[PDB]
Amino acid sequence: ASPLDQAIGLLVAIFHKYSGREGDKHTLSKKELKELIQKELTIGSKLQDAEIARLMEDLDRNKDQEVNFQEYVTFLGALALIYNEALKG
Amino acid sequence: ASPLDQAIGLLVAIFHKYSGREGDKHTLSKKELKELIQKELTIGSKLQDAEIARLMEDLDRNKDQEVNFQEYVTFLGALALIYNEALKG
Amino acid sequence: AMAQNITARIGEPLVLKCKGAPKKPPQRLEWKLNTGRTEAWKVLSPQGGGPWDSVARVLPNGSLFLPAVGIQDEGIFRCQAMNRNGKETKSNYRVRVYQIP
Amino acid sequence: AMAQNITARIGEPLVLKCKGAPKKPPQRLEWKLNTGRTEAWKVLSPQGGGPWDSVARVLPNGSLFLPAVGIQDEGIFRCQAMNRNGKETKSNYRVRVYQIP
């Protein structure tokens, strides 16, 4: 696969690395998502517990206490906007 | 940076690699986007010209003939859905 | 493509459970099935009914019962749901009757 | 943080052009500015006016003219737009008057 397909494939692989551990196999629990953030995000381990909790709460749009794949894409989009804004000044 | 931040950073870098070549520096023209697809997408070079044109047309939601960064994220989301659906069977 | 092998008899009643609706209130739901000609695919709603309603109904527990499964019922059935984001349930069950055309 | 250095005189009229609206029809628009106390930030709409409307208006070409820029006008001005996706324009201009408090 090409560099772009490989990067996307890596990001999808990360999701499933954690989503299948407990509860629903294809969604992220509060526990799984916090773990994903703390281990996969550069600044994840340094965030306040209250701020991770607010982050996870907001990602959940359908309000079922579960972060599906589409919610994870919202997170990726937020990260992309952050890096893009920094580069513009 | 961590694996996830690195992958996102790579994807953002690809966008700007092509967006700055002509016209607006921060958006993808029809020419830039077609080039991005043909060079960065595994199957890009094998797609019909008509299908690339339809793809680029649809990505443009605000209808200004320019594919901004938010439109590129829609493309990434579409790629992620494709790989995810294949894995589920 | 995944499908469960289930044997059935023509004109014989059959009941099945198709869960999916989360712990939240009754959300939206859509019925879809893939077959050769497809003549059973109907749109299910939490407030309303259609033609297939007379052919088969859904139990309050989210089940499905048919007065008599015939050749028209043959094929593969699939369940699906629609939330506020895009969390849908995927499942296909292959059903075939004894005597076929 | 980026800002343009522009000199101005208190009570002196000033005109500036703040483009952003694409080739499409008149879309939405929002006015925002960062200052110490901030007392000029107003919400601009394609169909309506407010208090700042009397302090400054926007030309059909998407410009801005002030009858007399004073200390209250000081600070940094910024333009912004809202489309169907999220294509906004970022630009901050630093403006200061001769005599200051």
Side-chain angles (χ1 to χ4, degrees):
Chain A
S2 295
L4 195 160
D5 293 82
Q6 291 296 15
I8 296 299
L10 193 169
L11 292 174
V12 178
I14 293 179
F15 178 88
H16 293 279
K17 185 182 177 180
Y18 295 87
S19 59
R21 297 187 186 211
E22 59 173 21
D24 194 84
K25 191 187 181 185
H26 294 152
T27 57
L28 296 166
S29 69
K30 297 292 185 177
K31 186 180 179 179
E32 295 172 325
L33 181 55
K34 183 173 182 173
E35 181 171 36
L36 186 162
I37 295 171
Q38 291 185 322
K39 291 183 176 180
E40 302 301 334
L41 190 66
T42 303
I43 200 65
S45 62
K46 296 189 183 67
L47 299 177
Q48 296 174 24
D49 291 323
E51 287 305 313
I52 294 177
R54 191 174 73 76
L55 178 61
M56 301 192 297
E57 187 60 48
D58 293 328
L59 286 173
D60 179 37
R61 310 286 175 158
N62 62 327
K63 293 304 185 188
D64 75 313
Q65 297 296 271
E66 288 299 293
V67 173
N68 45 86
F69 192 75
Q70 269 92 331
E71 298 186 15
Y72 175 69
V73 173
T74 300
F75 178 54
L76 300 179
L79 295 176
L81 294 178
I82 295 173
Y83 276 102
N84 183 58
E85 283 172 73
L87 297 181
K88 293 183 294 184
Chain B
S2 295
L4 195 160
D5 293 82
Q6 291 296 15
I8 295 299
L10 193 169
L11 292 174
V12 178
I14 293 179
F15 178 88
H16 294 279
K17 185 182 177 180
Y18 295 87
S19 59
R21 297 187 186 211
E22 59 173 21
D24 194 83
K25 191 187 181 185
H26 294 152
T27 56
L28 296 166
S29 69
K30 297 293 185 177
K31 186 180 179 179
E32 295 172 325
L33 181 55
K34 183 173 182 173
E35 181 171 36
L36 186 162
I37 295 171
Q38 291 185 322
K39 291 183 176 180
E40 302 301 334
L41 190 66
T42 303
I43 200 65
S45 62
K46 296 189 183 67
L47 299 177
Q48 296 174 24
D49 291 323
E51 287 305 313
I52 294 177
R54 191 174 73 76
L55 178 61
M56 301 192 297
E57 187 60 48
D58 293 328
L59 286 173
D60 180 38
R61 308 289 175 157
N62 62 328
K63 294 301 180 187
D64 75 315
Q65 294 298 273
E66 286 300 299
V67 173
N68 47 85
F69 191 75
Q70 267 90 331
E71 296 186 13
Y72 175 69
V73 173
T74 300
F75 178 54
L76 300 179
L79 295 176
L81 294 178
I82 295 173
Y83 275 102
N84 183 238
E85 283 172 72
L87 297 181
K88 292 181 290 182
Chain C
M2 296 185 67
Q4 282 307 126
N5 52 89
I6 310 160
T7 26
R9 178 259 168 79
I10 39 137
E12 181 92 83
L14 267 83
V15 186
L16 250 183
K17 271 86 100 107
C18 219
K19 54 151 276 187
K23 200 199 75 177
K24 306 176 290 183
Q27 264 103 212
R28 247 157 109 163
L29 177 141
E30 55 226 296
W31 226 61
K32 258 182 199 245
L33 47 112
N34 215 110
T35 337
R37 268 164 107 162
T38 316
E39 296 251 278
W41 170 25
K42 190 258 183 171
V43 188
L44 275 303
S45 263
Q47 207 199 132
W52 181 68
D53 193 82
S54 216
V55 189
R57 289 258 301 280
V58 186
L59 289 296
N61 64 309
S63 204
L64 229 137
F65 175 42
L66 243 138
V69 187
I71 48 121
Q72 306 104 246
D73 271 309
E74 290 176 286
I76 313 99
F77 289 135
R78 200 203 209 161
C79 271
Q80 189 133 111
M82 183 153 186
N83 294 150
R84 299 179 186 149
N85 293 331
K87 188 178 180 176
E88 50 171 77
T89 181
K90 170 184 167 289
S91 264
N92 261 119
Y93 318 145
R94 230 273 168 162
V95 190
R96 184 83 113 198
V97 304
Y98 264 39
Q99 275 292 268
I100 24 181
Chain D
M2 297 184 66
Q4 282 306 126
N5 52 89
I6 310 160
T7 26
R9 178 259 168 79
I10 39 137
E12 181 92 83
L14 267 83
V15 186
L16 250 183
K17 271 86 101 107
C18 219
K19 59 146 262 193
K23 199 198 74 178
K24 308 174 291 181
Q27 264 100 213
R28 247 157 109 163
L29 177 141
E30 55 226 296
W31 226 61
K32 258 181 199 245
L33 47 112
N34 215 110
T35 337
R37 268 164 107 162
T38 316
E39 296 251 278
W41 170 25
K42 190 258 183 171
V43 188
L44 275 303
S45 263
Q47 207 199 132
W52 181 68
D53 193 82
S54 216
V55 189
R57 289 258 301 280
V58 186
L59 289 296
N61 64 308
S63 204
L64 229 137
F65 175 42
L66 243 138
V69 187
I71 48 121
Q72 305 104 246
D73 271 309
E74 290 176 286
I76 313 99
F77 289 135
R78 200 203 209 161
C79 271
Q80 189 133 111
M82 183 153 186
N83 294 151
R84 299 177 185 152
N85 298 330
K87 189 178 179 178
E88 52 172 76
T89 181
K90 169 184 168 288
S91 264
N92 261 119
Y93 318 145
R94 230 273 168 162
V95 190
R96 184 83 113 197
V97 304
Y98 264 39
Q99 275 292 268
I100 24 181

